[PDB]
Amino acid sequence: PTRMELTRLKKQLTTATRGHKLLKDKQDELMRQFILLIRKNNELRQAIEKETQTAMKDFVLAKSTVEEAFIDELLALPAENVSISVVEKNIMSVKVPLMNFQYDETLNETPLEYGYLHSNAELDRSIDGFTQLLPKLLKLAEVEKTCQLMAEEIEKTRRRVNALEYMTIPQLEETIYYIKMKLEENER
């Protein structure tokens, strides 16, 4: 109920009301970026579901003729040792992943070129199918996860915008009035 307290609360009110307007602007920008990313998410997922299923079918057909014990031995000899680098990128207040395949770097001078011993054209070609889908599978992972994380952040942001607008700001305003009427009764 002092002038010192009034001063403090006034800074909080302008910080809250300015912050409310700018948080809404941030909500709008997240939405704009999310909508673009969602199109890409859909594009990538349709492409992947189609090429992945084709690749799998080709492999099933290819392996159907050859003995199981042969396939088991082929699969136990690695063609690559892929890991993924994941770096954190900020999109305003949300952390999202940037993903990149890390390949075996000691094998740079001899890049992948698939041919198995005593295999056949069809079987090797089906393996090449999988090799080809790899970059788009990583792409889909990164884009889909980002969209999932953005959706969550927009929901969080929306909650805060409403809370600021309808709870924080009116509470601050009310208190500022109480402090004010009390100071103004004194001097009168």
Binding site: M31, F34, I38, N41, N42, R45, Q46, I48, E49, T52, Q53, A55, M56, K57, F59, V60, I71, L75, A76, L77, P78, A79, E80, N81, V82, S83, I84, S85, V86, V87, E88, K95, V96, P97, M99, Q102, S126, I127, F130, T131, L134, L137, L138, L140, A141, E142, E144, K145, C147, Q148, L149, M150, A151, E152, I154, E155, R158
Partner: protein, 101 residues
């Protein structure tokens, strides 16, 4: 930052990923699949590809990780295709973002 790739699906469909150093598992039940996913996420896997038929059995587990940076749980078809779940889920993220439920 360096992370492993997991894959959960039927042997016929997902076996070729073994050639690339992906950790390939094959559960058939809710419990089996859920345990596989939690173990991968405990071992700091960056991505888990999961066939839709497997994913169909563990929506609750998948939703738990959705808000986490990793692991990214990505649904894929089997050689028999999809249940439409990956696609429906894109629409669900839209509805979440725009606040339509």
């Amino acid at each position: 930052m360096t992370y492993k790739i997991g894959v959960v699906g039927d042997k016929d469909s997902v076996s070729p990923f073994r050639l690339f150093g992906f950790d390939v598992q094959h559960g058939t039940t809710k419990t089996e699949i859920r345990k596989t996913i939690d173990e991968m996420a405990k071992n700091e896997y960056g991505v888990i590809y999961i066939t839709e038929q497997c994913a169909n059995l563990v929506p609750e587990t998948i939703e738990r990780y959705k808000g986490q940076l990793t692991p990214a749980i990505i649904l894929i078809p089997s050689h028999q295709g999809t249940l439409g779940i990956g696609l429906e889920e894109i629409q669900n993220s839209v509805e979440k973002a725009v606040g339509q439920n």
